[model samples]
Target: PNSLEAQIRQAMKTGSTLTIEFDQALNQKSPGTLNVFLHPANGGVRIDLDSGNQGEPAKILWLPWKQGELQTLQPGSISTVDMLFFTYYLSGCKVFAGDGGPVWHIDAPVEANQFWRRMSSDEWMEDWEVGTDRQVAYLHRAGQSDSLWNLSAYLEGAAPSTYGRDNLGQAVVGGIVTGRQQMSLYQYATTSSGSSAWSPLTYTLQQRKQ
Candidate 1:
């Protein structure tokens, strides 16, 4: 099967500028690039995620990368998943439990060649799980005070950070696993009906720039 690594390798053949832009859960376009390492470690291929930017902003973004993403990157792993999964830390809004629950949609209008680009060490960052090949997210968010860790499936506790897998089995980041009985992860689209309004989130890949 042609993998994301394959696509990236194919993209590398061209000398033209390469960029991978992603639509984040909050509707932000986070752009990045893959930098292949000359030295593979642990008898496997590997890659580094460079935000493709150089500045104070890059430094800030790389803080979490240095500790998290870079630590677990496995380029040539035999996993069926496209990329190594790690939490991308950035400063943004913190989510908590609320009466209405949280709603995530296009936060802004997307433009051609315009990268909305960024996340923070803040809480909104919790809404997403960014990876090398793809990103996992929930359709809804949490209250400003409620920790995503408690509300969503993304555990903020204990080592070997395990993600709670939902019925679909995708690494669930944010969901009603905790208080489906406690805080209510599901927002009923209709008023008491047979069908469930369990709106699943999304997994998005970066679109290559033409």
Candidate 2:
């Protein structure tokens, strides 16, 4: 199947390493830049966060799977970070969840190329393509539509991107997602009415390399 979701999953499985750099703000309050490094570990991935603050100690976490519950290796000011990254992993997430309606459309071909070039370079991407319109999302299970973890991203192409070219100029298969992603995390309610705060965490994904 040549779905965008499939492409992202292929890239992740091949690359096996992801690095994200972005600005995090909570309740419209700006915290410094956070660098996240995800590397394969023990049939799961280990995340190392460098807040870049002199006094704030670096944080470590273990996500048993891409969409697995977060286990704290070293705890810090994680309340905010936890909320943000928990959903971040949900994108190109390894876990399978039942998707409902609002089919994802592949952007123009040029958009895909533009995204690939930006990620391979040092410049930060400004524009993002698709975002959720308060869409209902489910996590972990395949059909738990009630659970919500809404995320938006820049879709590169209908196929995986080449990780790098060899000296002989052969394309290496790998998954890459760049540009910027903004996600909204909502608290669950019983029915009809529920309270939700929009904490928009926007980050320029420089690269998630192997």
Candidate 3:
């Protein structure tokens, strides 16, 4: 019960708020900073994302369980940050030993709708590598051909017993203590012209719990 999977479940059940400060840019565009608030709702977690971009409206989304109910408040808005908290790292994942170390895999179901068709395949899976010491090393999401997102947390120090890792930050149900997290977005095809446009962008994130 002291594993990352356990921690994530606990965090979601209790709900918490996460604030991410962007330190880098993907390209000419900057995502800026985000404040995300999570709550237990409808057998999943309800996420509210505030961009803090002045005139920009906040986005709300519902992260449901496998074969669970899906809902959104702000029309059609989704947050990768929100996914990093619960949905993407859902519980009941099957664990196996990879070549390098132990890996946990989760196959989340997708709706057979237009939104789901946008993906490379109907399959959505997340693989997390928890090193030999039981400490997290990296998280990878696969099943997409054109692009992929890689999230890696810099665990250079020890976190408090009350603090556990949440994607890159730390969490414990009602409160999450974020430290440092970096994400890489690999885009293989440009949506503009549908031509070959392979680009990989890395962004550093600094988190503060409020």
Candidate 4:
């Protein structure tokens, strides 16, 4: 594992940029949706979603690169990074890469039970009664071992009810599901100083620009 300071130093040396894209579609035929963000070496930004009649869209949030800073980086060696994605609603979803790298498809139904919550009733309820399922995916570079990367998605959904029996018990619900994906990339190089080794790269999405 690399310390925060070490990661910062590595970020300074590489001066890399992070990008995120979001999409939403009711079916597989549509183009879905997209949102993008770019972060420099200094300062950060936050991405927010809009709730419209068209429903909520899948959010990419922000991305940060840090695997290049770890001491475990070496030639012929492989390292893995973990990613987390969470949401509030249940939906059929899949993951893929447009860059022609590797596309991972997840055809599971999201449950409503796997979400955080706050309740107004005296009894602490689990907020929503729906259930959601989670899935994992991985990305591996070439010529590297230990390619088993872990990726997770979190779904947070809720349905609220009003009145005991009158008015057909009006109900209101909302959710924010996020998917976290992890991948590992490897690089090999031989220097004039007769030094050669394998290095690993880790990727993550942050809620803020920092």
Worst 10 residues of 2 by lDDT: 167-176
Each candidate: RMSD to true structure?
19.4, 19.2, 18.7, 21.9
lDDT of 1: 0.23
In model 4, which runs have C-alpha deviations exceeding 4 angstroms?
1-31, 35-42, 50-102, 105-210
Position 33, candidate 3: lDDT: 34
The residue-by-residue lDDT of candidate 2 on 33-129, one tens digit each, is: 3344443333333334433332123222212221122211112223332233222222222111111111111111223333234332322212222
The lDDT values for all models are 0.23, 0.24, 0.24, 0.21
For each candidate in turn, the TM-score is 0.20, 0.20, 0.19, 0.17
Q: List the pairs of residues colliding in candidate 2.
A: 11-175
Query: What would the TM-score be for candidate 3 when compared with the true structure?
Result: 0.19
Question: What is candidate 1's lDDT per residue for 144-186, written digit by digit as tens?
Answer: 1222222223322221222122211112112222222111222
- Candidate 4 per-residue lDDT, tens place, 1-210, comes to 253223322433354221112223212121212232212222211223434433323332122112211011111111112211211111122121211112222222211111111111212122222352222122221222211211222222221111112111111011111122222322222223321222322222211110
- When sorted by TM-score, best at the front, the candidate numbers are 2, 1, 3, 4
Task: Kindly indicate the candidate among 1 and 2 with the higher TM-score.
Answer: 2
**lDDT head-to-head 3 vs 4, winner:** 3
| Residue 62 error, candidate 3, Å | 16
- Report the error of model 3 at residue 201, Å: 21
Clashes of 3: 0
